[PDB]
Amino acid sequence: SKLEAILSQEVEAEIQALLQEAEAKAEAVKREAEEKAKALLQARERALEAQYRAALRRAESA
Amino acid sequence: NEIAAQIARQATVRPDLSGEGEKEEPFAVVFAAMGITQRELSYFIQEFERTGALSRSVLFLNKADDPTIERILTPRMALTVAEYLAFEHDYHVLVILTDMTNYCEALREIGAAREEIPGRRGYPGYMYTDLATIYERAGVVEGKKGSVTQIPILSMPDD
Numbered sequence A: 001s002k003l004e005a006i007l008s009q010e011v012e013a014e015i016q017a018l019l020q021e022a023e024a025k026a027e028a029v030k031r032e033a034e035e036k037a038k039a040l041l042q043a044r045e046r047a048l049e050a051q052y053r054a055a056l057r058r059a060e061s062a
Numbered sequence B: 001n002e003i004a005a006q007i008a009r010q011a012t013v014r015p016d017l018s019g020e021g022e023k024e025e026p027f028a029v030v031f032a033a034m035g036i037t038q039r040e041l042s043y044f045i046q047e048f049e050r051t052g053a054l055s056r057s058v059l060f061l062n063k064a065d066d067p068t069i070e071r072i073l074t075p076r077m078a079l080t081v082a083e084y085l086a087f088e089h090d091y092h093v094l095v096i097l098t099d100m101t102n103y104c105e106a107l108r109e110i111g112a113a114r115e116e117i118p119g120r121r122g123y124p125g126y127m128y129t130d131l132a133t134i135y136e137r138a139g140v141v142e143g144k145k146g147s148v149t150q151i152p153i154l155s156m157p158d159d
């Protein structure tokens, strides 16, 4: 009834705070998980670019 | 050989810390070699053709199957070239003199065809003057911009 609903609503407020801490926990994982993915992609294209510049200076000196 | 090739690959002079101005002249390399086998010569040639140094380096190769007395001429060949290119065209020459133990055995051989009285362990009495006349053809000159920097290599026998 309404009385059990108010009680399970207090417990649902605890549960909602529990989902909010779990959701911000998953977010605090995956924001920087996405950003380490992009940091990998950045450093990878930069290492390839270094190899490209070495290739061009070597071919033109040959 | 890897440390000498690494030095000659990346040895640069810093004008950021001295106020000279950039104007950056890289190194001519006079690479003299006396009784290298093939296994070290292929290393140095692959290293130089990779890092783009065979367009600034003059190579004096005396392999270990060439006859064992023209090692007496080879450091003098390399240093005459270095003295020219440094002190009359303003280069900044780096001379790699590979494995002077082979040179010193190359003149123990000659100095014991003449029964010349030796120093210790058979090497002749005058060898200090020959190593002196090789090594002391280096250094800078007052009034000029050239230089000769020597990295000789030694292979100490019982280290």
Ligand SMILES: Nc1ncnc2c1ncn2[C@@H]1O[C@H](COP(=O)(O)OP(=O)(O)O)[C@@H](O)[C@H]1O
Pocket: B113, B114, B115, B116, B117
């Ligand atoms: N026939 C030879 N072949 C090779 N070396 C020699 C011969 N004769 C002498 N020598 C070496 O050269 C030196 C020659 O000295 P010496 O004949 O006394 O005066 P000079 O210095 O005018 O020749 C000796 O110390 C010897 O070791």
